[PDB]
Amino acid sequence: ESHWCYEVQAESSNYPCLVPVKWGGNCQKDRQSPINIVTTKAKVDKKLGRFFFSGYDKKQTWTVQNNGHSVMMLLENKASISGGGLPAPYQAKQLHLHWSDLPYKGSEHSLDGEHFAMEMHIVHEKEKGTSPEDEIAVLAFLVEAGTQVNEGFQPLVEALSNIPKPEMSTTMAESSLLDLLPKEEKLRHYFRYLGSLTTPTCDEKVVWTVFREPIQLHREQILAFSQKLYYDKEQTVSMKDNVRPLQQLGQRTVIKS
Numbered sequence: 001e002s003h004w005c006y007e008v009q010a011e012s013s014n015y016p017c018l019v020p021v022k023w024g025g026n027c028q029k030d031r032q033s034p035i036n037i038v039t040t041k042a043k044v045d046k047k048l049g050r051f052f053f054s055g056y057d058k059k060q061t062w063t064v065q066n067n068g069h070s071v072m073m074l075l076e077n078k079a080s081i082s083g084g085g086l087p088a089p090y091q092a093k094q095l096h097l098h099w100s101d102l103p104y105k106g107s108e109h110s111l112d113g114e115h116f117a118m119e120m121h122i123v124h125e126k127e128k129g130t131s132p133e134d135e136i137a138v139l140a141f142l143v144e145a146g147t148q149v150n151e152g153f154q155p156l157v158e159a160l161s162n163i164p165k166p167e168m169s170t171t172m173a174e175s176s177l178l179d180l181l182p183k184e185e186k187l188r189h190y191f192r193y194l195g196s197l198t199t200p201t202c203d204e205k206v207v208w209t210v211f212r213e214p215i216q217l218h219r220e221q222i223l224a225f226s227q228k229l230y231y232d233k234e235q236t237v238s239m240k241d242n243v244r245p246l247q248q249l250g251q252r253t254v255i256k257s
Ligand SMILES: NS(=O)(=O)c1cnc(Sc2ccccc2)c(C(=O)NCCc2ccccc2)c1
Pocket: 067, 069, 070, 072, 093, 094, 096, 097, 121, 123, 124, 125, 136, 138, 196, 197, 198, 199, 242
C-alpha cells in the first residue's frame, strides 16, 4: 500500500508513493487549496475586521518536530484568535511551513501568479458553542528573503539542527508566536476564501486567511530549512518543495479586508 508524498519525493527515490495528482481522501474534490489569488478580482468586504490574538504574546518553550512532511510546532491550545470575520474564537493547534530552496517556488498559495520562498500555516480550530466548512482557520503567511535577520525566527531555525530526520522532536528555546508574525500594521490586509487542508485527507473544512504582505527572513534562515531537514531517516533527500500544486478556484470567490 503506498502513502502520500510530494512530487519531489517520488522523483528523488525508489519509494512508490502517491504523488499529489493521485492523493485519496477528499483531495480530488472541488473546494481544494491552495489556489492562485487574482488580487484585483478579490472584492473588499467590510465584514472582514482586524484579527485579535491571545496567548500570542506569551514566551514559551514549544515542542517542534519533523513528521516527514514539514517541521511542525505543537501549539497545544496555548493561543487563540478571533475577529478577522471569523464566527467564534479559534484555538491554535500547530504551526508548520512549506518551502523550497529557490525564491519563486516554496509557497503554496500564489498572488497574481507570484509564488514566494516559503509559506507558514498556523492551524486553529473553531471553539464550540457559538452556533462543516469553517471548522479550521489557517493563517497563512508568505515568506520572502530580506536584508535583515528575522530574530523572532531564530529559536525555530536553531531547533531545526535537532530534528534532521522524520519522527524526531525537540524543544525550542523560549519564544512567543508573536516573534513569528510581522507587526500588527502588516496584518491589516488579507484575503479570505473557503477551501481545504493541503495534505490528505484534504478535508474541505478550512476558512483560509492569506495575508497580503510577506514576512521577511534572511536568506540563510530560509535556506536552513532545506539544509538541515530530510524527508528520509538515511538523510539522502533534503526536505524542500513540500508544496501541494495549485488547485482550481471553481465557483468560489476570494474576498479581502
Ligand atoms: N497544510 S494545511 O492545510 O495548513 C494543514 C492543516 N492542518 C493540518 S492537521 C490539523 C487539522 C485540523 C485541526 C488540527 C490539525 C495539516 C496536517 O497535519 N497535515 C499532515 C502533516 C503535514 C503537516 C504539514 C505540512 C505537511 C504535512 C495541514
